[PDB]
């Protein structure tokens, strides 16, 4: 089970889906795209 873009998750364990290359931000703590 992964988290789509917008879902909030923990930074130590990024649970965002890797299908759209999403990572959990550190200040917002949510799935975001690469900068």
Outline where the chain has alpha helix (H).
Answer: none
Comparing C-alpha atoms, which of 29, 5, 9, 26 is closest to residue 17?
Answer: 5
The total number of residues written for the chain in this structure: 35
Which one-letter DSSP state was computed for residue 32? E
CA 19 – CA 3 distance, rounded (Å): 10
- Domain locations in the chain as residue ranges: 1-35
Handedness of CA 33, 6, 4, 2 (dihedral sign): positive
> What was the elucidation method?
NMR
């Amino acid at each position: 089970e992964c988290l789509g873009f917008g879902k909030g998750c923990n930074p130590s364990n990024d649970q965002c889906c890797k299908s759209s290359n999403l990572v959990c931000s550190r200040a917002h703590r949510w799935c975001k795209y690469e900068i």
